[PDB]
Design a protein around this ligand. Structure first.
Ligand SMILES: CC(C)(COP(=O)(O)OP(=O)(O)OC[C@H]1O[C@@H](n2cnc3c(N)ncnc32)[C@H](O)[C@@H]1OP(=O)(O)O)[C@@H](O)C(=O)NCCC(=O)NCCS
Ligand SMILES: CC(C)(COP(=O)(O)OP(=O)(O)OC[C@H]1O[C@@H](n2cnc3c(N)ncnc32)[C@H](O)[C@@H]1OP(=O)(O)O)[C@@H](O)C(=O)NCCC(=O)NCCS
Ligand SMILES: CC(C)(COP(=O)(O)OP(=O)(O)OC[C@H]1O[C@@H](n2cnc3c(N)ncnc32)[C@H](O)[C@@H]1OP(=O)(O)O)[C@@H](O)C(=O)NCCC(=O)NCCS
Lengths: 194, 194, 194
């Protein structure tokens, strides 16, 4: 079962929303660790559930690696208002954030370290690759494959059956209308390589 | 009252989400009919509620006609998280799909065979024409008239008071800013004839 | 505590949705005042909570001023499905509308007379200026400052950390990607001065 307290690493803005989700899940206390100007991570800390509240995908992956290596459990934070299909797969204890009013439909799969931000939608049979960030209000239609480390900006979307290659960025408001097997930064409606 | 079981015609991706909505409504068993590589529709089937889980508007209308002609009741599937104004009108037993977190505001009207997909919004006093599909995250502002058989793509929107003519397509991410009395395919921000 | 009845000023479309929110909050009766072709406002009316259901920001501010001057309390109408962070600040008894499925995240501030329309999202640490209208499905990313009297159109968004100057309009579907210190009308993806 979940611990009484939770370490949230990242005490910035993203950290504050993560705190709200942890409290929603029933955690009694959130202990912020921030190496910058709060309490530092220490490998010697008393054991509690961890969460990595870092928006940057590259840095979130590295921190995730360092925390995991010290034997800490990095839990998922999933708001109770997120609607997740009984046939969707969400990787267990994998540092995944699922914000309020997120919807994940039948047979979608969410990989480790993903952020599904506020009111995002992952349609049936999607695969969202590890340490991707689907940001506020971004939506993936049915059967969309998002590669590892991808970032879908605010209010972006991807049409059905499409793939976005690892390490790509879909800009805020962009509409991806063609399959993308080579990485890049895509902006506009329709989305075009920058 | 609803039957114990339901026939869902279409066993594809759209079918899977329809299954989830039926289960949410309290149906105990979903029986998939798919003429393609599952159990075939037969006019001789034992009577249960039917739903037509076909995304294509033209084909959904034809199947709806064939099922209705055999005397089957084609129910609405409405997720419990959909928020529907007490003054909105949703045509009864009319094969309408209303997905999670859909909002339908005061005095809007939804006609037979419509799909309102995940997190779509139908504002006050809208009329959504029969066998239209308002897809994931698409939004109609107040007093918008969507014609029969129309398709609003992912994350599209229509400004207040506007009409979209029968058999039109508003592309993914498109923003309709002018009245459209002649049918077509409209894409972009602002939306322009293709 | 809230009164038994409420005066809703504006009996148009916006008024109808306001009625729905008031009923959701537990008000027993909504009394429409419309100077146009319903019951007129009178300074002599029996005291009840008031709400100003006027979509136009300029007119809503003026009416708000006139009603306040006569000593009436102009309450907030907040749908129960709106998700508001315990650390967000919503100005009390300030004529604010918060529609269904609105999300307001940690430390955001909402000022008097604001409309947050259906399924809009205000991310952590935003400031939404008085008598602004964030319309249906519009989303502000973290740390966004919206000026007084601003109007964000249907399905628009603003990227993190940005400001929109007082009295500006972000058009339906627009994506604001740069800081804006001078007022104007911005349209497109990316949003550009009209
Ligand atoms: C696409 C993006 C990654 C590019 O950022 P960048 O490399 O720093 O680019 P700049 O901001 O300097 O702008 C470069 C050009 O691209 C354009 N551009 C930037 N973002 C754009 C967008 N999303 N849509 C269309 N054009 C965009 C700019 O207008 C500019 O055009 P110009 O040279 O003609 O003036 C960034 O703008 C973005 O959309 N990030 C998303 C952030 C987000 O959604 N946060 C999550 C919140 S929940
Ligand atoms: C508009 C649409 C119907 C047109 O599809 P199509 O006729 O097969 O057109 P194509 O995909 O071959 O593209 C033709 C051109 O239109 C453009 N285009 C296609 N969709 C576009 C969109 N939504 N916005 C802007 N441009 C678009 C393409 O970029 C292409 O431009 P080009 O010739 O300069 O390279 C389709 O792209 C679409 O948006 N359908 C929506 C699907 C959807 O939302 N599914 C529901 C999920 S919930
Ligand atoms: C931006 C806006 C304020 C401008 O309206 P306007 O001054 O009356 O302008 P017009 O409608 O006459 O159009 C003027 C031009 O701007 C364009 N335009 C208007 N709205 C646009 C939009 N949101 N995106 C891109 N272009 C837009 C028009 O296509 C037109 O282009 P053209 O001259 O090449 O033909 C208005 O279109 C708008 O987006 N308002 C939002 C309404 C809304 O969202 N309601 C709330 C519902 S919840």
């Amino acid at each position: 079962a979940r611990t009484e307290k939770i370490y949230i690493y990242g005490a910035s803005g993203h950290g504050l929303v993560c705190e709200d989700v942890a409290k929603n899940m029933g955690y009694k206390e959130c202990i912020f660790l921030d190496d910058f100007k709060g309490m530092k991570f220490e490998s010697t800390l008393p054991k509690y559930d961890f969460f990595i509240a870092i928006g940057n995908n590259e840095i979130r992956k590295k921190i995730y690696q360092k925390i995991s290596e010290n034997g800490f459990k990095i839990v998922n934070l999933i708001h109770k208002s997120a609607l997740i299909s009984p046939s969707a797969i969400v990787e267990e204890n994998a540092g995944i954030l699922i914000m309020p009013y997120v919807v994940i439909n039948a047979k979608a799969k969410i990989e480790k370290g993903v952020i599904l931000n506020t009111s995002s939608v992952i349609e049936h049979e999607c695969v969202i690759g590890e340490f991707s960030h689907v940001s506020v209000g971004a939506k993936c239609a049915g059967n969309v494959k998002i590669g590892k480390n991808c970032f879908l900006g605010i209010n972006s979307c991807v049409l059905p059956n499409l793939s976005l290659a690892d390490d790509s960025i879909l800009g805020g408001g962009a509409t991806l209308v063609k399959n993308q097997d080579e990485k890049g930064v895509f902006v506009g409606v329709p989305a075009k390589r920058m």
